[PDB]
Symmetry: D3
Subunit: 200 residues, 6 copies
Amino acid sequence: QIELRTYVFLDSLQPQLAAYMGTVSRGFLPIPGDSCLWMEVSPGMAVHRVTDIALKASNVRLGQMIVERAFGSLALYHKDQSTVLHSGDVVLDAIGSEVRKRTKPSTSWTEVICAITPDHAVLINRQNRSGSMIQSGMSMFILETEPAGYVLKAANEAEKSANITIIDVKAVGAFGRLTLAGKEGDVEEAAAAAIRAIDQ
Amino acid sequence: QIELRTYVFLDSLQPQLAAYMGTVSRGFLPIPGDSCLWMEVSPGMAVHRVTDIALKASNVRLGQMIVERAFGSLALYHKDQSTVLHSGDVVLDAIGSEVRKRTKPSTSWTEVICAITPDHAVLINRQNRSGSMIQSGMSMFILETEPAGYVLKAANEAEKSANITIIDVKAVGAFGRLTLAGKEGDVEEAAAAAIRAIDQISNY
Amino acid sequence: QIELRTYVFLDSLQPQLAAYMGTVSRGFLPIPGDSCLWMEVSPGMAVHRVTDIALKASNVRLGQMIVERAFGSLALYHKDQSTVLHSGDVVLDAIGSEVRKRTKPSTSWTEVICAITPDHAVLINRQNRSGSMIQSGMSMFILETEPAGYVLKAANEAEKSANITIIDVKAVGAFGRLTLAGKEGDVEEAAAAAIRAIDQISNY
Amino acid sequence: SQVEQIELRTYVFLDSLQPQLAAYMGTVSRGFLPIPGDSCLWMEVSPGMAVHRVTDIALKASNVRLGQMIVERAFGSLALYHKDQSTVLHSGDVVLDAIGSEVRKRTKPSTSWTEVICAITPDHAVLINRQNRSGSMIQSGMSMFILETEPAGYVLKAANEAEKSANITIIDVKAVGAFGRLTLAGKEGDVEEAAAAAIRAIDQISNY
Amino acid sequence: QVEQIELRTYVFLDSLQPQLAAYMGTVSRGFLPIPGDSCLWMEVSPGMAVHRVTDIALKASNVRLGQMIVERAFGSLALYHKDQSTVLHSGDVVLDAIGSEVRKRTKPSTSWTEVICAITPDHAVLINRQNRSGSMIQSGMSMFILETEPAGYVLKAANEAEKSANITIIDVKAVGAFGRLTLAGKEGDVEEAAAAAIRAIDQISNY
Amino acid sequence: ASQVEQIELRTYVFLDSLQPQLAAYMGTVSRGFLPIPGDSCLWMEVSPGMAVHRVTDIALKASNVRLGQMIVERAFGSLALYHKDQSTVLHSGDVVLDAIGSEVRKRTKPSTSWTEVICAITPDHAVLINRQNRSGSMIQSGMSMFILETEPAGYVLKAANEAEKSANITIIDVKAVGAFGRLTLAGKEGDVEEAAAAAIRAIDQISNY
């Protein structure tokens, strides 16, 4: 009685999100245009069997896999949507679940902050930061969701919709966080897109 | 609905505590004699707004800033108390809170251990120890509080009161932990002063 | 108030478990054949006193010592079983506890997966793996228990019983995790012995 | 030990720190973070531990702050920051006088490698993003400018100038080591401008 | 200009043996190899020239970048593909583009090799604890070690040792001023592995 | 199969009795079996780096010393051997030196590339020092500081032990592995000048043995 908690499909990874996920991935690496499936199941120890099923079902490659007590996560990459989707479906059949059984994203913090200062920028740039640098004077959008993975979708759509800089995209754990920066207007556009993407 | 979890004001950083915080800070660095304000707010994501407010309110510098879900922390430094206090005043007005809304320190452990052995020292000295080294044969004082930031006040007041060695001051997370070492008598003076400091806060 | 959470005595560290614990230990190091006692105690801060008592009680050496709020753990090593058991005995008398007061292991996952793929093997090999490498095509046994420390007994017994490869043994935290690999038949042999070892502690 | 033993491997003065460089320097150094527009004096010396004397002298001569101090395998480096150009230069003057040296006595930079590479591949880009990168992310398709020098310190000056002259992205500026390594990326036109600026800066240090 | 480039290491692995593939996947920062994949490893001076070589190699064929790193002084990379000819072609294009050839590669100097039998428990833990990325050594095992200069060459030694013998890979540190190979297991197996490692280094020198 | 004549004995250093801070520091910093204060320590450094394995194996098989450290760095290999009994440590050292056809007086001689005392460390300087990959104790601004850089690197260990014998100072770091060895002590000016003198004596005694 494994259960699905998160399912997030990304048809095509935007440039920065691809570079970002490429930076933090601990398995195979994604490249721009790759399709990506992010899943989360409980209990966490079940992620291994799910991973094995996914990898044997197709040519999809494994980018990430994290085991915690309560939940486990994995990320799958391939240039073909169909390959990614097929592996998803085989997994879903094997555990007797389906997309709609996933928990929906609830956003618990959404905010734009203007003209960040140099001290604030250093701390942002230093602490577990895997994307690009924020420069003081920039504006910033921050977003938190639960479950965590859905933040990948917000990030991709945000990037599709505006000229901004990806700073960090935390998709692991119970809480998803997105941080992006740039000119205030672009940032406000990205924020709207991000929130919109979560609302579905 | 930002809430105040912790507020800890330090008038003047004692030499070891400033060296220690100098060691662990990921932002601007403190030096001996700086004032420091440490705050925790909930939810954690709120620490970014508070930080921005704080740094635009005055000439304070940001020393630390940490996000977790339930809460976040920040540490502010400046050579002038009024500068540090002003940023605090501005933050508390901005979020509609006040000092006496802070969560009261709960002390979960307090003890002195005499004549630490070599293996014990090595483990202490190695596992995320950012202060000075403990030597086997020293006595040691350990303190745990909840919420965490309060141990900074216990540490500054212990150093003020006694000739001891700061080994570690864990102020981030849900639980604060202080480790001091030295000669038994000194360690006992430090222990008493650390406990006084927390008690004051509890009774404020 | 100081209570015993876990008690795990290993009569003799098998070669791979010795080399694994030797890799991760942050104090004194174990060598093959050494006897080992792992204890968990609550609250976490009590582990310092328990450690001091153990080391002053005999010639055991301290290999690990971890503090978390709810509980803390320590590992004791010595070539002689009697020396290790004695330190445990002195600790249990000092805190008014005994072995049968420990929390029984609860197994939340046990599974053998055959013919692991290359991507899957790389993630395992990279993410805090401290033991040996898993190779794709190998079979794998994964075990999770709570409390954590009991996986050490499962690992040692698995090694005694079968020709396998130790990939990882997480004994710290609330949840213990064992990962072994090798040829299918051997891995199932190891899996069965691991389970026996845990059930045995459950029924003690 | 005698100041006669000291080699002044790098001496580089940055009048005004550009924004990306300032953000990067703050991220990467172990000292007091700079503000964009601050002046910075960077020095590198041999033997490594002589950097302590240079540091003590600099810090007691003015209100400069210590932005960086590091002792590497062989060499010691420091950065001094202040918003006032003259405050920084005064600390420099006091140091050079104290060690019996002067700007022109500084070891001249040799360029061991420099290149623009267009249209970086996805594979190439992700390796770059993954190998101890402290700056911003390179994206495949971008062009890239690469500069390696010895001594290492000079890439700092090259980096600041390149940022002045063009719109590009700073990936890394590794100014400590046997060799200094500057990496920046962006649109080919911009990158080419940055490249020329960087090379000019290095050449000027030579013909000075 | 390419004339400045010293080709410190050129190594071609026809087929990555299982342990070495598991190892190179664990330690490398690029796309992981599948066992059996061919691999080309190159090391150049000056260090940053590895960028040009990398870009030429990747633009020339379907190889993947398994590794690329610039160390204190030197730059190295690993190219992977299932098919020998695809990897080889990448290397050919690179060597032409920089005006070099396999026989111009710097020749490995062997700065240290030996077999040590019956490793002690103290010695074993220290090996297990010092930045080890491979498998665990057990006391009582024999050990083969090899240090070369340039560093890249231990990679060929390792693959060939794995072909010849049933041993355990502890580490293959192919980046640095010196390259360092550490293999362990039963004495006779280790002696076979050792002999094959040395023949591999000699074969390189006499190509 | 390499021969011992290829081995350069870069450092040979015998510590009769590890002083308290140095014992704590070496236990913190090393990757082997931690020392007890008072323990004897034999520290050796060799070229080529991987030759340290042969030295290690001979050392351990000759006596009951524990391996307190063994490391192969960019170029060089070092180890530390501990035992409470002076003679037990010396024996391993004797067996090792004979096995490689060497002797104490063949050790490469320490060159001092830098040494000085700086008084009244500023707050800025002090904080960088505490932040620079430090394993030892904290320096406080206002203290004086002694620094010693040698080549080969291992020799700073002997200087550190002797300095702690002579004065009440604070060990900040003793980096004995690398192209250069680096020692940093701090304290009250008088005490630091005393420590400095003893450290320098120790390096000179080595060259004159």
